[PDB]
Symmetry: D2
C-alpha cells in the first residue's frame, strides 16, 4: 500500500516542493498566480502551470492495482470584461516530465486541438472561452488526451468570486467526479464520467494546475489558486 498527501492553505514565496512553469509566481498574499498581472491588470497571451514536485504513484502494473485520489482547491478568475473572458484553468495529471504546451485555448496542455493517446493527459477544465471545438457557453469539462472534452456541463463564471472545487477518482468504478461550489451565491455544479486511468496515464504522474489568458489584448482574465489539498491511495492487491 502506498499513499501520498499534501495540504497548502496558502502558498509561500519560492515553494521548492512545487514545479512552477511558464509565468507562474506566488503573490505576497500567498496565492498561486498562474497568469501574469501587470499594474493590477491581467496580461494577454500568458500561460503558467504549477505541479507538485513528487511523482504520484497512480497505478502499478505488477500488482494490477489503481489508486483512488481526491483533490480539493479554491480558485478565483477575475475578468475585466466577463463577455471577453479567456481562456481558463485546469487541474491535470500528466507524465512526470510534462512541460507547458500551446497557450490560449489549448490551456498549456496540448500541442494541437486533436486527440492523441501519447499525450497521456487527464484534466478537468474550467473553460471561459468558446473555441471552435467547444460547446456553447462557459463550461466545466473532463478531458482525456484532447482539448475536445469527453463530457461537459454548463458553468456560469462568477467573476472574481472564490470557487471551491473537489475532484475525486474512484478506481473500483473508474469514475472521475468534479464539483464546483460558489459559497457566495450558493451555486453548485457537478459532473462525472468513466475514465480508465490505467489505460490513459503512466504508472507515475505529476499533478497540478495550468491556466492561460486570451491571445488578444481585450480577452484577458486572472487565474489564482488560493489553497490546495491532495490525497492518493494505491491499495494492496486483492
Amino acid at each position: 500500500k502506498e499513499t501520498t498527501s499534501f495540504v497548502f492553505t496558502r502558498f509561500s514565496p519560492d515553494p521548492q516542493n512545487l514545479l512552477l512553469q511558464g509565468d507562474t509566481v506566488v503573490t505576497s498574499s500567498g496565492h498561486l498566480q498562474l497568469t501574469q498581472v501587470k499594474d493590477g491588470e491581467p496580461v494577454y497571451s500568458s500561460l503558467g502551470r504549477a505541479l507538485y514536485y513528487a511523482p504520484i504513484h497512480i497505478w502499478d502494473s505488477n500488482t494490477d492495482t489503481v489508486a483512488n485520489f481526491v483533490t480539493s482547491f479554491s480558485f478565483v478568475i477575475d475578468a475585466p470584461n466577463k463577455a471577453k473572458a479567456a481562456d481558463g484553468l485546469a487541474f491535470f495529471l500528466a507524465p512526470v516530465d510534462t512541460e507547458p504546451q500551446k497557450p490560449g485555448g489549448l490551456l498549456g496542455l496540448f500541442h494541437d486541438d486533436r486527440h492523441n493517446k501519447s499525450n497521456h493527459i487527464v484534466a478537468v477544465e474550467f473553460d471561459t472561452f468558446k473555441n471552435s471545438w467547444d460547446p456553447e457557453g462557459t463550461h466545466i469539462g473532463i478531458n482525456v488526451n484532447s482539448i475536445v472534452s469527453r463530457k461537459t456541463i454548463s458553468w456560469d463564471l462568477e467573476n472574481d468570486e472564490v470557487a471551491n472545487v473537489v475532484i475525486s477518482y474512484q478506481a473500483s468504478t473508474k469514475t472521475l467526479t468534479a464539483s464546483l461550489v460558489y459559497p457566495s451565491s450558493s451555486t453548485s455544479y457537478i459532473l462525472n464520467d468513466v475514465v480508465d486511468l490505467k489505460q490513459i496515464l503512466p504508472e507515475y504522474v505529476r499533478v497540478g494546475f495550468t491556466a492561460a489568458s486570451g491571445l488578444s489584448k481585450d480577452h484577458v482574465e486572472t487565474h489564482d489558486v488560493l489553497a490546495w489539498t491532495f490525497d492518493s491511495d494505491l491499495p494492496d492487491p486483492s
Copy 2:
C-alpha cells in the same frame, strides 16, 4: 482544537458504537438495513435510524468557534415499483438525546409537517414520495427544523443502484453542500445552501441516518447504507 473521525467500509453485526433506533439491523452482508425486509421484500410502515454513539462537538459558545465537517456514504434504495417508491432516507444532525419521531413522509425526523425551531434538526433528505408539502418529483432536499425543505433539486432514483453521497459544511461561509453520484450511469447531482449551524443546533449533536418505508402496503422500498465516513474539526479561536 477538537476533531472526531470514523470510517466504516462495511458494518459488523451488533455495532456497539452505533445507536440503532426503530427497525434498524445489520445484515450478514455487512449493510446497515434501516427499514425491514421480510422474505426478500421490503415491509411497509417501517422506520429505522442509526446514530454514531459519541456526541460530536459542532460549535463552542465560549470560544465562538464552529466546526467544519464532511461525511461520505454509499446507499441503495430498491423499490419493487419505482412509481410507488416511499418514503426515503436522510442524513441528519440532531440533539444528543434525539429519538425517532413520526414514520412515513416525516422520515422519523419530525413530529409534524410544520416548522419549529425547537426541533434543532439539520438534514439532507433523499425523498422518494411526493407528500402534500413536497415539490413535484423525487428530490434531494436540505431541511432545517422542518420536513418542508429549505432548498430542493430534482433527483431521479436509480432503482437498486449504489449512490455515493458527500455532505460537507464550511463554517466560514455557513455553507452546507450535498452531492450524489451514481457511478453505474455517470449521473450526478449537487446542491448547497446557507445553513447557520450555530443558530440551529446545540453545541453537541449526534449524527446519522434515518429512513422510512411507505405507510401503505404497495408503497415500499428498502434503504441500505453500505459504508460511511465522518470527519469534524472544531478549530481553535482566531
Copy 3:
C-alpha cells in the same frame, strides 16, 4: 475496515463526548482534572476517570481481525511533597460498562490486588506510590487484569512538569508499547510487552484515564490531562 479517531488539544467545560466518573472535572484552563483540588491544593482520597463516549471496536470475532491503535496524551502530576506522592494515573481499556473500582493504590481500576481474567482490563500506569505489590521506586507499568504489573520500568516523577506519552498496539506482533518524554529536561522512558488483546478484552471497549490521590492527608498530588489523541484501525480480513 473500521477506524475511530479523536483529538483534544484542550478540553471544554461539560464535555458531552466524555464519560466523566468519580471526581473528574474540566478546569477553566481546559485541563481534565482527574482528582479533586480545593483552594489550590490536592485533596486526599480522591478518584476520577474519563472515558471517550463511543465504544472502540478493538477486535472482531466474525472476521477474526484485531485492531491496531495509537494514543498520545500530555499529563501533569503536581505533588506538594514529592517523597509523599500518591497514587498515580493510568491510561486504560475496559468493558463498555466499566465503572470506578477501589481508590488509592488500586487506581480506580481494580476491586482488589489479585489477578482475575474477568476484569478485562489492560492499562498503562504511572505509579507514584510503592504499594506492597509494587517494585522499588516510582515506575511505569503495563497491567493486564491486575494491579500487579506484568512489566515495569523505573520512572522519576518530574514534579509539575508536562509529560508527553505515546501508547501504541501492533496487532501483528501483539505488542503494546508505552513511551514518556519530559521535553523540559530531555528525559525519556519506554517499555513494551506482549499483550494479546483478543484474549483479554471484549470486542468493544471504552478507553480513557483514571487517577487517584493517596489515602492519607499528607500523601497527595494532582493528576491533570492537558491533551489527548486516539486512533484505532480494525483492518479487513486477510
Copy 4:
C-alpha cells in the same frame, strides 16, 4: 499552513518518488535494500541511500515558523557474524541537493569525522561498529553536523529481527525523539535531545535513509527498510 505525508507499507520496483543513491535497490520481496547483497550474502564496502523525492518544508523564515514531524519505519540488519557487524543505518535530514559522502563508519553522511556546520545534517544513527569516535558497544545516536553523536544510548542489535522506529520532532520544545522497539524480544530503546532545526537546516530539506557495510570483507551486514511513513506539519504563524 502546509503539510506533507506519505506511506509505504512496502516498496515497488523502480520507485520514481524516491531518489535512490549509491547501491540501493528494491527487492522482489518489496524491501528497500540499501547495501548490496550477492548470492544471499552482504557485500563489503557498500553504501546506499534513499530519499523522498519531494523537498520537505521544515521551516519558513517569512512567517518564522518551524514544522513538527513524525516518521516511522521498520528495518532489518542481518550480520553473518554479529560481533563483526558493520557499519549501520541512519535516518536523516539534509539539503535538497545532498549526495552520498564517505562509506564505512561515516555512513554515507559525512566527508570526514569532524564537526562542520556546513554539513547541515541532522541524523539518527543505528551504529553497529565502534569507530575511534564512538562509545563502547553498539548504540543509537542523535547526530548534528558530525558523525560524533551529540547523545548516544546502548542498543543491542537483534540480528535479523524487525526493528520498529519512530522519530519525531516537536517544534515548540525543539525536541527530537527517537525510539526503537523489537516486538520479537519485547526490548525497547529511546532517547531525545534539543535540536534547533531552524539553526541547523535550510528551509527545505530531503529526508530518508543511508546505510553502509564494513570496509573489510569479514565485517558485513545487510540493511533493509521494510516500510516507512512520514508526516510533517508547518503551522500558521502564532
